[PDB]
Design a protein around this nucleic acid. Structure first.
Ligand SMILES: [Zn+2]
Lengths: 179, 60, 109, 102, 356
RNA sequence: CUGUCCCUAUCUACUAUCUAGCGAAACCACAGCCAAGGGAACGGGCUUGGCAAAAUCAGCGGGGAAAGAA
RNA sequence: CGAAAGGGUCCUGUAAGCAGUAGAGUAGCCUUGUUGUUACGAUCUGCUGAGGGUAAGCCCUCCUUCGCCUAGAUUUC
C-alpha cells in the first residue's frame, strides 16, 4: 500500500479511489477521480488548468525549493528493518511536517505581502471621487442638536459624537396602502 | 367598479389605444362617476386620465 | 411578546424551490413566502407588497433569487368584525447582499 | 498523516535532521519569521460608499423592469410632502423652507 | 422470481424479529444471544489476507465494510416461557426499577400530552415491600420455565437521530440451567450491556432488518423480467430479511479516540468520515464494523444475533488484520483523511490569512 | 459497398393520480369461489366434497367470446 | 422544535473592479528622434484554489441570533 499521487492534479490517490489507464507505450496513468480522467481523455493540459498542482508550481503558487521538500523522495534502494530507525523516522516525519507548515505560512505571507497598500489607495480614490456619498447627518438632528447644545452650553463635539453613534447603529420597499 | 366604458371613451377621446390609457387608481370613484366624453375630458385636464408615451425603440 | 412587531428575516427560496417545475418557480415562491410569514408570525392573513412581488418576478418565472431578505410586520386588523384580529404585511428591504444577516427586530422609533 | 514512512526513510538521517533544526535556529535568529486609525477609518468610509452604490443600483434595477415598458412621466405623477421632506432631510435640507407649497 | 419470499407483503413491524434463537444446551456458559444497533453507512478497508488456497494469500485486498453504531444497551426485564403442546407460551414477565423515559416513550404513542403514568404502580410494587410478590414471580420462572429472555432497550438519546423512542426486544439467554440464567438476568437488571460483551471480533453473525422500500414497482424491476407464480405488479421493498454469515471485523470502543487506527497507519482518527456520515451524522459510541453489505437504510434499527449453527468454513476461524480505514468524505469524491491532512496539502487560504 | 438489422437525434399523433364544482354512455333474466359426477365431446343453479367473516382502494397479464363438420 | 448565521464537507473553476508601459496594434504635439512625447487599446500577470452553490433526503453548534410551547376538536372499557 502506498499513497499515490494523481497524475493530472496531484491530490493523494488513495487505494480504491479512482481509475488508472494503461497506454500501449507501457507506463500507467493513475487518476484520482472522474474529473481528472475525463479531462485527460479530452486531452486538456494539466499545466494549463488552474486547479492543478502543476499550475501552482508553474505559476509559483507553491514552494519548489526547500530542504523540507528534498527530504521527500521515492526510494529505489531498499533498506533493512530497524526498530529505532523506523521510530526516529516517525518523529522526523512529525518535525518535518510542522516545519513545512510553518514555512508554507511564511511563503504565503511573503507572496501576499502587498495588500494593504493597494486597498488603502483604492479607498483614497473612492473617497476622493465619491465625497458626496459619505455619512451625512440629518436636518432634524442638526437642528435638535443646536437646541440641546444651547441647553448644555459644545455643538461641534455633540455633532461628531452623534455622527459616530448613528454610524455605529436598511430601507424597505414601499408601504401599506390604507384600506 | 367596472371601468370598461371609461377606458373605451378615454381611448377614443385621447386618440390612443386602450393599452396607452392610464386611470388613476386612487380616483376610481370619480372616474366611475364620470360617464360622458365631457366629464372624461375634464378628468384628462385634471390629470386623473393620462396618455402614456410610446415604447422606446432605440435604433442605435 | 408584543402583538404588533416587525422583524427582518432571510428566506432560502433555493431550499423551498429545489425541484419545482420551471414554469411554476415564481408562483410557488409567492406561496412559500406566504407560508413562511404565516409560520413566523402565526397569522393566516398575510399580505405581500407589490414591490415584493416584482422582486420575486424580477428574473422571470424561472429565475427566482436564491435568498430574499424581507421585513414582516404584524399589526392589528380593525376593519369591522374581521375574522382575524392580527395581520402580517411582508415587505422587501434594500440590502447590499442577502447573506450574513441574522434575524433582527426593527424599531419604529 | 497521509505520508509514506517508506518515502521518508533514509539511513544516516540524524545528520539531515540536525542540519534541519540548525537551519531553523538560523532562520529565527536572522528574522525569517519575525512578524511585523486613519487607514481603518478611510477603509470604513470606502465600504460605506460601496454599500451606497449597491443600494442605488438595487433601487435602479428595482424600477427598471425587464423589457421596455411605457412608464408614467414624473411631471404627470404627483408626490407627497412626506416623501419630499424625508428625502430632503436625508440629504440635509432645512425643512421650514417647504410647508405651504401645495 | 423466488417462490420462498412470495407473500411480498410489507413487514408488519419496522424493527424485525429474530424468529429463531440458537438451540440451548446447559453445557455452555451463560450468555446473551442478540443485540441491536443503528446503521451508519459503509467505508473501505484493505486487509492483509491470510487465506491458504487463494491467490490473494499474503496480499492486500480492498474490501467493503458497513458501520453499525451500538451504544450500550440497558436491561430492564426478564421474560419466562413454558413449553406446551401448542408451542411456547409466555408464562410471565418481571420488569425492573426506574424504567427510562425512552422505554416509556416506546410504551406510549402520544407521549407529549400523556400524563407519563407507566409502571408507577409497578415501582410501588417494588418499593412497598411486595418484593415477596416479585420474588414469587422469579421463583415461578425458576421452577416452571424452560426458555428465559431479557428485555433490553437501546439509547436513542446517545444515538444521533431526531427520534427519542427506544427499541425493546427479548434477547434469549443460553448455556445453563433455568435458575442460573434467571439469576443472571436479575443481576443484569438496570445495567447496560456492551457490544464487545455480547459479540467479539472475527465472529460470523446474522443481521435482521427491514430492506428498503420502493413502493409500487413494475415487474421489470420487481422480478428482473425481460397463478401465484406469475410476475405481478405491486409492493417491492420494505421487506423483513435475515441475512446470514457476515464476519464482524472490528468493535470500536468509541472512547478510544483512535477507533480507525490500525497498527500500520499510526494515525489518531475515529471511524466518523471527514464531514460525518451522510444522512446519519457522527458515530460517537461503540461501533460494529462488519464485512459486506447489510439489509436496511442508514439510521435504521438493526438486530445482530449469533449464528444458529456451528460454522463449517475456514472463513469463520480466520483472524482479521486491518491496515487502514477509509475516513474520506462520503459527500463526494474526497481524498483527505483528516482536516490536518487537507490543510497541509492545500496550504493556507485567503480566509485563513484574513482571520489570523 | 449494400435491395439487411438495431440503437441515438428531430418532427408528427395518441398517451395523466387525488381534491372543489359539473357530470354521461355502452350494457343489464337473476346471479357470480373451486374440484369430481351430472350417457345426448352441455353447465350457473343439482349430488358431495373443499371450504367459507363485515365495508372498501389500486394493478391486472386469467374466466364470463367464438366453431359445424366433409 | 423552527428560521437564519457560523464552521466543516463536497461541486465548479479563479468573480466584479483596479493596477503594471508587460502588451500585438490605432492616432495627435512639436521638430528630427541617437530612448521623443500624449491618448486609446485587444491580450497577459497580480490582487484570486478566488468568487459562486452547499440539503431541498449532508454534517456540527455553548449562552452564535430571533421566534415558539403545557394547545383545540372528537371518541372509548
Ligand atoms: Zn486528480
Amino acid at each position: 500500500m502506498r499513497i499515490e499521487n494523481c497524475f493530472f492534479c496531484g491530490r493523494p490517490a488513495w487505494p480504491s479511489k479512482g481509475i488508472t489507464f494503461m497506454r500501449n507505450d507501457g507506463k500507467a496513468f493513475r487518476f484520482c477521480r472522474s474529473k481528472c480522467h475525463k479531462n485527460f481523455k479530452m486531452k486538456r493540459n494539466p499545466r494549463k488548468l488552474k486547479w492543478t498542482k502543476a499550475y501552482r508550481k508553474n505559476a509559483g503558487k507553491e514552494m519548489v525549493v526547500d530542504s523540507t521538500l528534498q527530504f521527500a523522495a521515492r526510494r529505489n534502494v531498499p533498506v533493512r528493518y530497524n526498530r529505532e530507525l523506523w521510530q526516529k523516522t516517525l518523529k522526523a516525519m512529525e518535525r518535518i511536517s510542522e516545519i513545512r507548515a510553518r514555512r508554507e505560512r511564511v511563503f504565503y505571507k511573503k507572496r501576499m505581502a502587498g495588500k494593504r497598500a493597494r486597498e488603502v489607495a483604492a479607498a483614497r480614490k473612492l473617497v476622493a471621487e465619491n465625497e458626496h456619498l459619505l455619512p451625512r447627518l440629518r436636518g432634524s438632528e442638526k437642528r435638535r442638536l443646536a437646541e440641546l447644545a444651547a441647553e448644555r452650553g459644545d455643538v461641534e463635539e455633540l455633532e461628531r459624537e452623534e455622527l459616530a453613534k448613528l454610524a455605529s447603529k436598511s430601507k424597505a420597499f414601499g408601504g401599506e396602502v390604507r384600506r | 367598479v367596472n371601468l370598461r366604458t371609461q377606458k373605451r371613451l378615454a381611448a377614443s377621446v385621447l386618440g390612443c389605444g386602450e393599452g396607452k390609457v392610464w386611470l388613476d387608481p386612487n380616483e376610481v370613484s370619480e372616474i366611475s362617476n364620470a360617464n360622458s366624453r365631457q366629464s372624461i375630458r375634464k378628468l384628462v385636464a385634471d390629470g386623473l386620465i393620462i396618455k402614456k408615451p410610446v415604447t422606446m425603440h432605440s435604433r442605435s | 411578546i408584543a402583538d404588533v412587531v416587525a422583524r427582518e428575516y432571510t428566506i432560502h427560496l433555493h431550499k423551498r424551490l429545489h425541484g419545482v417545475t420551471f414554469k411554476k418557480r415564481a408562483p410557488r415562491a409567492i406561496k412559500e413566502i406566504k407560508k413562511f410569514a404565516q409560520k413566523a408570525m402565526g397569522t393566516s392573513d398575510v399580505r405581500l407588497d407589490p414591490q415584493l412581488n416584482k422582486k420575486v418576478w424580477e428574473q422571470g418565472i424561472k429565475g427566482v433569487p436564491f435568498r430574499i431578505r424581507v421585513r414582516i410586520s404584524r399589526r392589528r386588523n380593525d376593519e369591522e368584525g374581521a375574522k382575524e384580529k392580527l395581520y402580517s404585511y411582508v415587505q422587501a428591504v434594500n440590502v447590499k447582499n442577502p447573506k450574513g444577516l441574522l434575524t433582527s427586530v426593527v424599531e419604529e422609533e | 498523516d497521509g505520508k509514506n514512512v517508506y518515502d521518508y526513510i533514509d539511513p544516516d538521517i540524524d545528520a539531515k535532521l540536525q542540519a534541519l533544526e540548525e537551519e531553523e535556529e538560523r532562520l529565527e535568529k536572522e528574522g525569517f519569521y519575525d512578524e511585523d486609525e486613519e487607514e481603518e477609518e478611510i477603509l470604513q468610509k470606502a465600504e460605506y460608499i460601496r454599500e451606497q452604490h449597491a443600494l442605488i443600483r438595487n433601487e435602479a434595477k428595482m424600477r427598471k423592469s425587464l423589457k421596455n415598458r411605457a412608464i408614467i412621466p414624473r411631471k404627470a405623477v404627483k408626490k407627497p410632502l412626506s416623501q419630499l421632506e424625508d428625502h430632503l432631510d436625508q440629504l440635509g435640507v432645512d425643512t421650514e423652507a417647504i410647508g405651504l407649497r401645495a | 422470481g423466488s417462490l420462498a419470499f412470495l407473500p411480498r407483503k410489507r413487514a408488519a413491524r419496522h424493527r424485525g424479529r429474530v424468529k429463531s434463537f440458537p438451540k440451548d444446551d446447559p453445557k455452555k456458559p451463560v450468555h446473551l444471544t442478540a443485540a441491536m444497533g443503528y446503521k451508519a453507512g459503509m467505508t473501505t478497508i484493505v486487509r492483509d489476507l491470510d487465506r491458504p488456497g487463494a491467490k490473494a494469500h499474503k496480499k492486500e485486498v480492498v474490501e467493503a465494510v458497513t458501520i453499525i453504531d451500538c451504544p450500550p444497551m440497558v436491561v430492564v426485564g426478564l421474560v419466562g416461557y413454558i413449553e406446551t403442546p401448542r408451542g411456547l407460551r409466555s408464562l410471565t414477565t418481571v420488569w425492573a426499577e426506574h424504567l427510562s423515559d425512552e422505554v416509556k416513550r416506546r410504551f406510549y404513542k402520544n407521549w407529549y400530552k400523556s400524563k407519563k403514568k407507566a409502571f408507577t404502580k409497578y415501582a410501588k410494587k417494588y418499593a412497598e415491600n411486595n418484593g415477596a410478590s416479585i420474588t414469587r414471580e422469579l421463583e415461578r420462572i425458576k421452577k416452571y420455565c424452560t426458555v428465559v429472555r431479557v428485555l433490553a432497550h437501546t439509547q436513542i438519546r446517545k444515538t444521533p437521530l431526531k427520534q427519542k423512542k427506544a427499541h425493546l426486544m427479548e434477547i434469549q439467554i443460553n448455556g445453563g440451567s433455568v435458575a442460573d440464567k434467571v439469576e443472571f438476568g436479575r443481576s443484569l437488571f438496570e445495567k447496560p450491556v456492551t457490544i464487545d460483551t455480547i459479540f467479539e471480533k472475527d465472529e460470523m453473525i446474522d443481521v435482521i432488518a427491514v430492506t428498503k422500500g420502493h413502493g409500487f414497482v413494475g415487474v421489470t424491476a420487481r422480478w428482473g423480467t425481460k397463478q401465484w407464480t406469475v410476475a405481478r405488479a405491486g409492493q417491492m421493498g420494505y421487506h423483513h430479511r435475515t441475512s446470514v454469515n457476515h464476519k464482524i471485523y472490528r468493535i470500536g470502543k468509541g472512547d478510544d479516540e483512535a477507533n480507525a487506527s490500525t497498527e500500520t497507519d499510526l494515525t489518531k482518527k475515529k471511524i466518523t468520515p471527514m464531514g460525518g456520515f451522510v444522512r446519519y451524522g457522527e458515530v460517537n459510541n461503540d461501533y460494529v464494523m462488519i464485512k459486506g453489505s447489510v439489509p436496511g437504510v442508514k439510521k435504521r434499527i438493526m438486530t445482530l444475533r449469533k449464528s444458529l449453527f456451528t460454522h463449517t468454513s475456514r472463513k469463520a476461524l480466520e483472524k482479521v488484520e486491518l491496515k487502514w480505514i477509509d475516513t474520506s468524505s462520503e459527500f463526494g469524491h474526497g481524498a483527505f483523511q483528516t482536516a490536518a491532512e487537507k490543510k497541509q496539502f492545500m496550504g493556507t487560504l485567503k480566509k485563513d490569512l484574513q482571520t489570523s
